Coordinates of C-alpha atoms and ligand atoms in Angstrom, one line a residue:
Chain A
X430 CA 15.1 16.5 26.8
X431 CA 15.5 15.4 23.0
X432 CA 16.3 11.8 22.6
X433 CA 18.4 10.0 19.2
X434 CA 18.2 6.6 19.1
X435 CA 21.2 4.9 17.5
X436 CA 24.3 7.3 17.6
X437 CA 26.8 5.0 16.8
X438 CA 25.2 4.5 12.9
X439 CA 25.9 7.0 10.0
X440 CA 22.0 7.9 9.2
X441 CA 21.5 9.1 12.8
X442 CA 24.6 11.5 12.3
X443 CA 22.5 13.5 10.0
X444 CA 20.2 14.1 12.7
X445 CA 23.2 14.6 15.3
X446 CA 25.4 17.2 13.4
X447 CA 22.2 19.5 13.0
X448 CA 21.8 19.4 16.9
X449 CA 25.2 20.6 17.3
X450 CA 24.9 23.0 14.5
X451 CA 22.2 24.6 16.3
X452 CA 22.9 24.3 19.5
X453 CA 20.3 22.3 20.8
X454 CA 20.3 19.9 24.5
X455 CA 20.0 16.3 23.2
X456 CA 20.9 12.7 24.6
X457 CA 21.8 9.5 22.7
X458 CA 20.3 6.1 23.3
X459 CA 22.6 2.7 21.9
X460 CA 20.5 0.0 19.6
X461 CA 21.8 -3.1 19.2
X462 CA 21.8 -4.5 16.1
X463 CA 23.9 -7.6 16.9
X464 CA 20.9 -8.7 19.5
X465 CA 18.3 -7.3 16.9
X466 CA 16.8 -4.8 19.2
X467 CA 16.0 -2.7 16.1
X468 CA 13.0 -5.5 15.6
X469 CA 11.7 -5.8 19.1
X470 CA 8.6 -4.8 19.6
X471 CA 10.1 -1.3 22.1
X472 CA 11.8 0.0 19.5
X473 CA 9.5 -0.9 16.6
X474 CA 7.1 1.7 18.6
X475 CA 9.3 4.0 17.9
X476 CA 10.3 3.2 14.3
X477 CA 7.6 0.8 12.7
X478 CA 10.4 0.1 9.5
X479 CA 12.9 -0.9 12.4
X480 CA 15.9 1.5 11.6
X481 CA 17.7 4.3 12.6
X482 CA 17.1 6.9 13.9
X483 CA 13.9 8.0 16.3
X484 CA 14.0 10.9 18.2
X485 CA 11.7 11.7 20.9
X486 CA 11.5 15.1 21.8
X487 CA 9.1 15.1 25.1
X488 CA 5.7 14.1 23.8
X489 CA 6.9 14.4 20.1
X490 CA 7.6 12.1 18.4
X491 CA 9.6 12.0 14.7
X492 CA 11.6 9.7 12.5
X493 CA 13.4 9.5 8.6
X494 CA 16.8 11.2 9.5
X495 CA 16.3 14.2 7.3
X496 CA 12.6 14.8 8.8
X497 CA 14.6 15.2 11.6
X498 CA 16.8 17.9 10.4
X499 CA 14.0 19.6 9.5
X500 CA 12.1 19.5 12.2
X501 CA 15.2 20.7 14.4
X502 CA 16.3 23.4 11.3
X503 CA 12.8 24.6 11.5
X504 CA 12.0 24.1 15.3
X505 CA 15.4 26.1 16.6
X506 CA 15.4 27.7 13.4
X507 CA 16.5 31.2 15.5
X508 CA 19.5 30.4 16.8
X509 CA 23.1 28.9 15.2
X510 CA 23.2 29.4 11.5
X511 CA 20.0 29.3 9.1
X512 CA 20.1 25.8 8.0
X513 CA 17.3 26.4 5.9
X514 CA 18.3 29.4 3.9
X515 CA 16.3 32.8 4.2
X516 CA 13.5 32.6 1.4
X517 CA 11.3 30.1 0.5
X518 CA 13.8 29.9 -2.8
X519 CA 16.6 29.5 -0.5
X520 CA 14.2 26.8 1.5
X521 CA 13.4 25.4 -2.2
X522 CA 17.1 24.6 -3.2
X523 CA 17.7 23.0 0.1
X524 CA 15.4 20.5 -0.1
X525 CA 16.0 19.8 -4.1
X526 CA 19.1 19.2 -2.8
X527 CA 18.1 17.3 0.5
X528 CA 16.3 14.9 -1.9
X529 CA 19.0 14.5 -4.4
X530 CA 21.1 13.1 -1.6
X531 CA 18.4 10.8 -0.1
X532 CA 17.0 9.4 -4.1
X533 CA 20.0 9.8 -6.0
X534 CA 23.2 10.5 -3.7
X535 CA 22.7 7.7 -1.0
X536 CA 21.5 4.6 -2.8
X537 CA 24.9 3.7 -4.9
X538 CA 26.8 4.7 -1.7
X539 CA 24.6 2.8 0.3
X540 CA 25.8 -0.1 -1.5
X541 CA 29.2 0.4 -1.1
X542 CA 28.8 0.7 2.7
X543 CA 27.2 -3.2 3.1
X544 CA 29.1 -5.0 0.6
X545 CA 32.7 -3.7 1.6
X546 CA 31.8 -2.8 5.4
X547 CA 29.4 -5.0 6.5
X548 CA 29.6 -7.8 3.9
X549 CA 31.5 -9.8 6.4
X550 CA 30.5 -8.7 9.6
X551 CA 26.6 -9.1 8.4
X552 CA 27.2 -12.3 7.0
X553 CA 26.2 -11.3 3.4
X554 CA 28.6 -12.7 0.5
X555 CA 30.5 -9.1 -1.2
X556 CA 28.2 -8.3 -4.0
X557 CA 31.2 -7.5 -6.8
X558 CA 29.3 -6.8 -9.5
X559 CA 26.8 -4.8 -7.7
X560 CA 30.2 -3.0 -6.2
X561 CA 31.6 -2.0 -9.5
X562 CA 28.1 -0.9 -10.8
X563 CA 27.5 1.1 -7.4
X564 CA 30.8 2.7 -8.1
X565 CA 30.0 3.8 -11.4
X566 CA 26.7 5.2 -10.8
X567 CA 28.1 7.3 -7.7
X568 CA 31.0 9.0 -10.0
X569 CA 28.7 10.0 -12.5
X570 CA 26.3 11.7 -9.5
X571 CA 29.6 13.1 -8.0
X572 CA 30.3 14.9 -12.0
X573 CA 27.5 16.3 -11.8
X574 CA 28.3 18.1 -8.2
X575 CA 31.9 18.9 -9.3
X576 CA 30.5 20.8 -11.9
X577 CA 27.3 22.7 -9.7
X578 CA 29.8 23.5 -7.2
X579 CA 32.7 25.3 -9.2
X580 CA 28.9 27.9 -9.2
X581 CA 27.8 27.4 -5.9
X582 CA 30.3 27.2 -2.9
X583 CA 27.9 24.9 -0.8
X584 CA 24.6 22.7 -2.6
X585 CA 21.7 25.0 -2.1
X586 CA 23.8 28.6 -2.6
X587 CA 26.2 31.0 -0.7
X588 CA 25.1 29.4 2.9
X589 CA 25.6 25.6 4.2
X590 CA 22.0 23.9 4.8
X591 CA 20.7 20.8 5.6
X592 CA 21.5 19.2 2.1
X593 CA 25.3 19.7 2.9
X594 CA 25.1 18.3 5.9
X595 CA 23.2 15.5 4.9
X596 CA 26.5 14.3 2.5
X597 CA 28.9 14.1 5.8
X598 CA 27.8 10.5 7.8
X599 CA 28.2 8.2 4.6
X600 CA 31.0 9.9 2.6
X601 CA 32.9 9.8 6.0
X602 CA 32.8 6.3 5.1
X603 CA 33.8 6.9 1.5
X604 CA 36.9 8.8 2.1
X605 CA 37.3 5.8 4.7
X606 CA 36.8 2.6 5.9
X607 CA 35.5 2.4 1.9
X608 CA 38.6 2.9 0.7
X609 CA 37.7 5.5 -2.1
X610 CA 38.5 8.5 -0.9
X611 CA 39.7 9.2 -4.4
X612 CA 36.3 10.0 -5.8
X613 CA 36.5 13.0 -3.7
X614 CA 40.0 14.0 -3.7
X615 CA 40.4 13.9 -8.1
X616 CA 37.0 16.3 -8.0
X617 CA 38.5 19.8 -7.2
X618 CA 34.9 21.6 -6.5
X619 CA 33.7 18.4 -4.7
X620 CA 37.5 18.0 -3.0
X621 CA 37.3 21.7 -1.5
X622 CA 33.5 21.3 -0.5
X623 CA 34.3 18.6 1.5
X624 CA 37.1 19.7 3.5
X625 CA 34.8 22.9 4.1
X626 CA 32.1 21.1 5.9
X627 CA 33.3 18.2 7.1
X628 CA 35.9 20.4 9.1
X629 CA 33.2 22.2 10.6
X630 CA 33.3 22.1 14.5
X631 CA 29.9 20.7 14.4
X632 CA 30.8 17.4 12.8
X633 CA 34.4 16.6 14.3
X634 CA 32.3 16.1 17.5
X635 CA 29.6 14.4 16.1
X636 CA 32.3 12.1 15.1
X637 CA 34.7 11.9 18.6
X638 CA 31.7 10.9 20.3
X639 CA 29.8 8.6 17.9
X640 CA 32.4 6.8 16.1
Chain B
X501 CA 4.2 31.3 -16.1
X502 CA 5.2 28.2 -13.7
X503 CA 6.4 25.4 -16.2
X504 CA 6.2 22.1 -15.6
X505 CA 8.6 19.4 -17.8
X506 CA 7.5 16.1 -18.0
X507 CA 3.8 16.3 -17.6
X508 CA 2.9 12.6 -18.8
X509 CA 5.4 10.6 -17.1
X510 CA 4.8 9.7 -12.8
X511 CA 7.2 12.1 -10.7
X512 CA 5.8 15.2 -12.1
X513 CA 2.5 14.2 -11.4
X514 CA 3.2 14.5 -7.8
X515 CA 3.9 18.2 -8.7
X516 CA 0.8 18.7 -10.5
X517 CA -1.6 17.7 -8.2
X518 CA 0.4 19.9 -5.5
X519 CA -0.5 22.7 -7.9
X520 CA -4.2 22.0 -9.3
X521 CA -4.5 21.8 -4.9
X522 CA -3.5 24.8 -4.5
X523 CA -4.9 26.2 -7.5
X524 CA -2.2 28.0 -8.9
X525 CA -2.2 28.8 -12.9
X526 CA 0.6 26.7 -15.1
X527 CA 1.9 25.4 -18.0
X528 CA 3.4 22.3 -19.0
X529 CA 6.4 21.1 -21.6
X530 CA 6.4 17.6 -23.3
X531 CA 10.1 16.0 -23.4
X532 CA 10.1 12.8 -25.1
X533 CA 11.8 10.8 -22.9
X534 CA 11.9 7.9 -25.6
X535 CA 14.2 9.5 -28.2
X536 CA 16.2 10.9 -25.1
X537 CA 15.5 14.6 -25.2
X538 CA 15.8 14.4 -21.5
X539 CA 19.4 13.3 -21.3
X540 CA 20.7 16.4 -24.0
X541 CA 22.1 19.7 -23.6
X542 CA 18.9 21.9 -23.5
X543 CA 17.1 19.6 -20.7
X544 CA 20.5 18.9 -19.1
X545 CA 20.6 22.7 -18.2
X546 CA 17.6 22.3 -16.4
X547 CA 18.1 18.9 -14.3
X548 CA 21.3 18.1 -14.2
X549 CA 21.1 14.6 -13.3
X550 CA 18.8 14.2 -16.7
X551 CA 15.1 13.3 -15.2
X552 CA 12.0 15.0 -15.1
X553 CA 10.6 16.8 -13.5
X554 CA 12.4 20.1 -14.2
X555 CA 10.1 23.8 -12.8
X556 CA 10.6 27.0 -13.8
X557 CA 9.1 29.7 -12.3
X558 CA 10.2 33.0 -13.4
X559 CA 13.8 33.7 -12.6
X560 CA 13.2 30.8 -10.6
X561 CA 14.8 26.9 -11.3
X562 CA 13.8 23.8 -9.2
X563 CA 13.9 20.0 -10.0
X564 CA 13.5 16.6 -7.7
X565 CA 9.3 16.1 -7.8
X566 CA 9.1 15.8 -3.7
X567 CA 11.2 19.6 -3.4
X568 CA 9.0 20.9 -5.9
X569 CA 6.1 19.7 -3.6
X570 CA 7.4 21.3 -0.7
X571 CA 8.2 24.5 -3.0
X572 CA 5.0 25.3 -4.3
X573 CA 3.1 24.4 -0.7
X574 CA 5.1 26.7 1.0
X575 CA 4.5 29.8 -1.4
X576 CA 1.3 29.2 -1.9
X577 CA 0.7 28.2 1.8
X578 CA -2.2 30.6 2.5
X579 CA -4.3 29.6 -0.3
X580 CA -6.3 26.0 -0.6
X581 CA -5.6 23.3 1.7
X582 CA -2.7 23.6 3.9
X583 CA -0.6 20.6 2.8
X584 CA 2.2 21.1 5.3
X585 CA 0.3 21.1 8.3
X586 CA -0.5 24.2 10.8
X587 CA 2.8 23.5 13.3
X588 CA 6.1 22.5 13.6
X589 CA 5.2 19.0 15.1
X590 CA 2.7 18.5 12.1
X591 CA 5.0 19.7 9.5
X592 CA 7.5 17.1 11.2
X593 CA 5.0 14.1 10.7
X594 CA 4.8 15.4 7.2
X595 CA 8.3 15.3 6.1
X596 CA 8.3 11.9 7.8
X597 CA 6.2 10.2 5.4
X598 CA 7.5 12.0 2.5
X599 CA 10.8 10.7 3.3
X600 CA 9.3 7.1 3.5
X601 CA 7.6 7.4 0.1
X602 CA 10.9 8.7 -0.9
X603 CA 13.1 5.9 0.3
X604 CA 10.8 3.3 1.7
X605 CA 7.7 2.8 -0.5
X606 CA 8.3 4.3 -3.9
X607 CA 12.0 1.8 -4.7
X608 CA 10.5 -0.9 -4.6
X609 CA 7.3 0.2 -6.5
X610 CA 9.4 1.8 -8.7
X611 CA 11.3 -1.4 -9.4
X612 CA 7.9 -3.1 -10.2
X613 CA 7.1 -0.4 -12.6
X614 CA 10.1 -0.5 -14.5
X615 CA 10.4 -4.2 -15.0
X616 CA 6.8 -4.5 -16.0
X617 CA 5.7 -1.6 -17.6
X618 CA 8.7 -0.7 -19.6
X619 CA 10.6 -4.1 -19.1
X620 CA 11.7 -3.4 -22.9
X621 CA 13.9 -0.6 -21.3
X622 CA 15.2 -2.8 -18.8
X623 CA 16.1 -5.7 -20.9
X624 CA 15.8 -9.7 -21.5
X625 CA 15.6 -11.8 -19.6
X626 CA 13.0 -10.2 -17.7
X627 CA 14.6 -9.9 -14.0
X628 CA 11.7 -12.1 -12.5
X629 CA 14.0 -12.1 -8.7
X630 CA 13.8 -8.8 -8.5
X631 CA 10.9 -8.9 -9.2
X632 CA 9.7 -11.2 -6.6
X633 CA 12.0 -9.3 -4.2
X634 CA 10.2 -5.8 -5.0
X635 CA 6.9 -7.4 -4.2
X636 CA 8.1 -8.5 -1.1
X637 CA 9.9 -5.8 0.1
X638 CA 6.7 -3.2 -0.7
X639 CA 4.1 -5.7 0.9
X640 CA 6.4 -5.3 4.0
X641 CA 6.2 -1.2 3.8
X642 CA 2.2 -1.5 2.8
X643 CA 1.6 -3.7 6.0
X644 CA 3.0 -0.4 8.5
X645 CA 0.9 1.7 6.8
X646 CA -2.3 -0.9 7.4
X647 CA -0.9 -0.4 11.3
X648 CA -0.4 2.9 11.3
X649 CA -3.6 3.8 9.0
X650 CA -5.8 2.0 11.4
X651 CA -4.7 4.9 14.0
X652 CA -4.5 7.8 11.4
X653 CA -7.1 9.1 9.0
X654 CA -4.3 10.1 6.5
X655 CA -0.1 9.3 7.0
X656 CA 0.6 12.5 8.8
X657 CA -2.4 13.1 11.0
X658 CA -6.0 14.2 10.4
X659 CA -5.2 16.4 7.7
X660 CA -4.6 15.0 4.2
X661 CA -0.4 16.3 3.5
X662 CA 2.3 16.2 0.8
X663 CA 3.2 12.7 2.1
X664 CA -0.2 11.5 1.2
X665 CA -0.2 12.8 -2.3
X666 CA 3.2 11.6 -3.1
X667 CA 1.7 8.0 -3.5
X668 CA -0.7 9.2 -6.2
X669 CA 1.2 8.3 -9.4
X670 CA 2.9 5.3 -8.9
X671 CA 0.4 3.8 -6.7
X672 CA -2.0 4.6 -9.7
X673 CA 0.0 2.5 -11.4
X674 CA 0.4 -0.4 -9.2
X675 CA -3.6 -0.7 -9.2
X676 CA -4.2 -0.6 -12.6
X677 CA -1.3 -0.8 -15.6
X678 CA 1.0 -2.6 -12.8
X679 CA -1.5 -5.0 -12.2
X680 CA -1.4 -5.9 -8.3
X681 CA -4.3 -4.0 -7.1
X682 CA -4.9 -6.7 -4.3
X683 CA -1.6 -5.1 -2.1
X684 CA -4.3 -1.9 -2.1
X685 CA -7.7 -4.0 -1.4
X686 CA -6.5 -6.8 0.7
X687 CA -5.2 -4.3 3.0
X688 CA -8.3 -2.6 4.8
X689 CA -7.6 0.5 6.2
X690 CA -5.0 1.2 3.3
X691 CA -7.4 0.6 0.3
X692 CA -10.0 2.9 2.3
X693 CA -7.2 5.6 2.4
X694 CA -6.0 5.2 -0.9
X695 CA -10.1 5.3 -2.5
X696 CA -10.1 8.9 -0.4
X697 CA -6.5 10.1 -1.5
X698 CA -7.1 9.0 -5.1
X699 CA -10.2 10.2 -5.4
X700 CA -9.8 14.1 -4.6
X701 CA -10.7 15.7 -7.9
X702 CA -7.3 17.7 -7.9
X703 CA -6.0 14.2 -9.0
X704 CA -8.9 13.3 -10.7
X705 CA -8.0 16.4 -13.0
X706 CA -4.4 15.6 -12.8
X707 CA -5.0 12.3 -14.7
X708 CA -7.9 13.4 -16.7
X709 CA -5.4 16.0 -18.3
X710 CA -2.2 14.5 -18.0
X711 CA -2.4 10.3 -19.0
X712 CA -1.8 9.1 -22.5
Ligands
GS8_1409 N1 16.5 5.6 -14.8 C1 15.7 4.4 -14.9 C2 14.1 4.6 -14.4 C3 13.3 5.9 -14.7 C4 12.4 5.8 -16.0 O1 12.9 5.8 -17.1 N2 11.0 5.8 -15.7 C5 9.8 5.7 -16.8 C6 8.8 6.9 -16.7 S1 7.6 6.5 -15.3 O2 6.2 7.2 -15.8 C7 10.4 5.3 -18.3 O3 11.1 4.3 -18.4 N3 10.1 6.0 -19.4 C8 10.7 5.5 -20.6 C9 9.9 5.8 -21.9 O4 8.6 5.8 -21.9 O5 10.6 6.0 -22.9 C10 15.9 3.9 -16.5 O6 15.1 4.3 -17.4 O7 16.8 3.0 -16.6
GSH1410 N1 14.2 11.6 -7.8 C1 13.6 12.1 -9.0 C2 13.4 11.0 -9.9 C3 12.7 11.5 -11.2 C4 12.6 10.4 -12.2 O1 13.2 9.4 -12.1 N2 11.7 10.6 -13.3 C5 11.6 9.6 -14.3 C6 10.2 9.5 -14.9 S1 8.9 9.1 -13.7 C7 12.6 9.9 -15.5 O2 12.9 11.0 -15.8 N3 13.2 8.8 -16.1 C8 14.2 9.0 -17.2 C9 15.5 8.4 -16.9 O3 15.9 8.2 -15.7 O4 16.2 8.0 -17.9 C10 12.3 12.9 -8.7 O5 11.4 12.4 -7.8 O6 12.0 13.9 -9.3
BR1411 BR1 24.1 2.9 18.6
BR1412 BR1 5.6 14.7 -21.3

């Protein structure tokens, strides 16, 4: 059976929602950060850069989070909904905008997550400078998806994909423990799009059982 | 018919060689990235997020350098080499590595090649901590691949991929205009990998045409 290391962490959840989605037999696997298991030499077997997730799926053996989505999307790709999209255009958009969230998306919000949610608990001093700039940076990348989406009812076209889904484990914590849930909310397009997918059935478990 | 904006500059580089690969016919378009023709209306309709590259093909609009990648390997897949692998599994290992170039390998680099190659555009003082901390960070990423290229002819198996060709432009840089070739040669089984990768006459092409 399919194996996720790390469940309780935000970048696994990409990787966890898409199992769901499709319907596919997996089980989770804890890492301790706290005891730094992520840089003992077990786990670094699994994931030579020491982070989460790795998924072993018998002899298989894959990680990157949204590698993982795509290896599921295309793997199961016959049964739940087309993650992927039908054509290779379809396929095309979804991984324009699969990359848009991991070079462009992600980074600011990334920021946001360690200086206001783990600044303390990691022992780092709260970066705010580098929160105000992050900030910034992520409203501008959120303009520009309020005004593609008032087009487009999900990122890629008509259908939800992988890119979508990609946006739910770290602007959980936006609309969160963050405390900006306002960058959403004031964005109508972005506002609605939200409250499409991360109400989908798929992603409340993900989060009752991994939060 | 296939347009490619941006030919001179790094990320669309990865798209070219993708294409000269697979030999499909193209053209390219110049923006000036200098005087900002990148970040006005008539580009802005093409990549929203004002960066290059921007494709057009046909009816067709794509942008972000590793999608088009993917793009024009899968619709071209049966012609040239395939860079996606044969399977599932392969095609897994290959998304793998070109979401560590993505995230991983290329910030870093990226951050060296901003700060000293156009440190005018970043400003003075020259950040030299950053600096420090970019070296750092990608001699930490270049030192798994020395591991993991000492078990693998290229990153995603036996077959050179998309995640191999990724590392062309920047990487091109580091070596030369960057000046830190030694994170390539110190490291054995990388600087053998990269004198292979970088040495394909699709890239050899790519730059021959495409430098300035
Ligand atoms: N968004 C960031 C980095 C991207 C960039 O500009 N990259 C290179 C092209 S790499 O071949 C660049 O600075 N070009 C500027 C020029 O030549 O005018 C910035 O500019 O602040
Ligand atoms: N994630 C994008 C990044 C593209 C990118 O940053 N391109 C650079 C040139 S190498 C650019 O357009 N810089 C102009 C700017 O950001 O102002 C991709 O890979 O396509
Ligand atoms: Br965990
Ligand atoms: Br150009």
């Amino acid at each position: 059976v399919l194996k996720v290391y790390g469940p309780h962490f935000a970048s696994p959840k990409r990787a966890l929602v898409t199992l769901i989605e499709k319907g596919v037999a997996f089980e989770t696997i804890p890492v301790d950060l706290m005891k730094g298991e992520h840089k003992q030499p077990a786990y670094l077997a699994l994931q030579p850069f020491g982070t989460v997730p790795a998924v072993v799926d018998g002899d298989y053996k894959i990680f990157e989070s949204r590698a993982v989505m795509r290896y599921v999307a295309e793997k199961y790709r016959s049964q739940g909904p087309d993650l992927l999209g039908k054509t290779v255009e379809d396929r095309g958009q979804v991984e324009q905008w699969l990359d848009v969230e991991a070079t462009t998306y992600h980074p600011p919000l990334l920021n946001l997550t360690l200086h206001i949610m783990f600044a303390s608990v990691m022992g780092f001093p709260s970066d705010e400078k580098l929160i105000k700039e992050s900030e910034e940076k992520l409203a501008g990348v959120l303009d520009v998806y309020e005004a593609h989406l008032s087009k487009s009812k999900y990122l890629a076209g008509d259908f939800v994909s992988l890119a979508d889904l990609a946006h739910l484990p770290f602007t959980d914590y936006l609309v969160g423990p963050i405390g900006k849930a306002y960058m959403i909310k004031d964005r109508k397009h972005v506002s609605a799009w939200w409250d499409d997918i991360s109400s989908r059935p798929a992603w409340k478990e993900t989060v009752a059982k991994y939060s």
